[PDB]
């Protein structure tokens, strides 16, 4: 890699100062390469990764539905099909470099709940976003792997955090988007909505001001998906 | 769409 | 070239999609592209060209901006000078892009005031950016530069572009820029403003209401410019 | 800082 040569604190610095200047390109290759120096990354390092990835693939995802768009309306030459296929890839290049950073080595090295919580979410996420694209059996099989993923997550969530845990609360949120707009589940994702957002009312007594504030806007986000969906 | 974890 | 072997028509018809996603890297890449066809841009391609490079350098300006002030309060490790050397090098090469679309062969073949006169404007503006970053000598020979093609610029628009015409006034807005700006002359600036303002206020009586509307959009800038400058 | 022509 090209951030071989570079001390990981200074990657991690650099990273910093590429969100500060909104270079999320630059930030994700940062934080890339800390990542393959091997170490296990601490919580303000594991929100930089996926920060740095959730712009960049953000992007990607904006243009492609522009794009598609496009093209669905131009199916009511080749060169918006081929211009949405060019982002897809670079897309699905993306999701690809992410899942194998999770596989090469973080989520295997991640023994605590907060960490394999954290890194499992990230693997059904960037699954989620290569549902978004993908066309037929190949559909099938990455719906199945973001789920999967989701599962181990919500299980061990479960177990050993709080219902407000904010990392839980957003995997909660993440898997309930999944089931509403990947899996054609959209009872199931109204279910965990609710279910999720009112074990957490009745844990956020048990948090302090900073807590409780981290706590509800993630809960804010559960009841304005219910308000979409019911 | 619906809304998932911001991006940060 | 990676655009060679694709047809000028089809690297037209994609910097208008990128436009329309906000790809704006992959928008100036295209139209590179068509410009490397070799022959001539008609006004709707000159204004693609300028709106990808604008906002591909538009971002980079932002970054380094943040950086700098970063770095300069630490003024007040290398990580912080190196990611900003970074990202200014990235700024040149891009400015550097640009000039050299202009000098091969853009602007040699451009005989109509219109492209003359927007090539000119275009080449000042690329200039000015390498100025808002160089430092010591190259800085002055930058600045002269700038000038200089603003100044032809001028020269063309004044003998053979009425006062409205909005290239003309978004010229005169950019050289007033370049003058408060980079060149230490405010009183330039101001006197560049407001005699472009008054000139085109007299001339707005000939305009149909959609020119009209493109003119005063200008306009208002010039006025901006002088509320903060006076 | 100064208003320049906008972007597009
Ligand atoms: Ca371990
Ligand atoms: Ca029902
Ligand atoms: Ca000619
Ligand atoms: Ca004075
Ligand atoms: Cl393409
Ligand atoms: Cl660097
Ligand atoms: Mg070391
Ligand atoms: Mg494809
Ligand atoms: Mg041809
Ligand atoms: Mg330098």
Redesign the interface.
Known sequence: GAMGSMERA?LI??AK??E????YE?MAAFMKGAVEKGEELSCEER?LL??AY??VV??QR??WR??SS?EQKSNE?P??R??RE??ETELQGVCDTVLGLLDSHLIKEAGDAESRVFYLKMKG?YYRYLAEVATGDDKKRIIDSARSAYQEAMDISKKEMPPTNPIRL?LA??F??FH??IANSPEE?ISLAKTTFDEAMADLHTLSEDSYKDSTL?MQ?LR??LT??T | RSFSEPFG
Chains 1, 3 share one sequence.
Request: net charge negative; aromatic share 6%.
């Open positions: 200074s610095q650099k100062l590429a500060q200047a909104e270079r630059d929100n996926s920060v959730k712009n953000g992007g904006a243009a522009v794009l496009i030459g060169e918006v081929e211009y060019k982002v996420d957003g949120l993440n309930s988007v509403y707009e994702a993630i986000l304005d998906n979409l969906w």
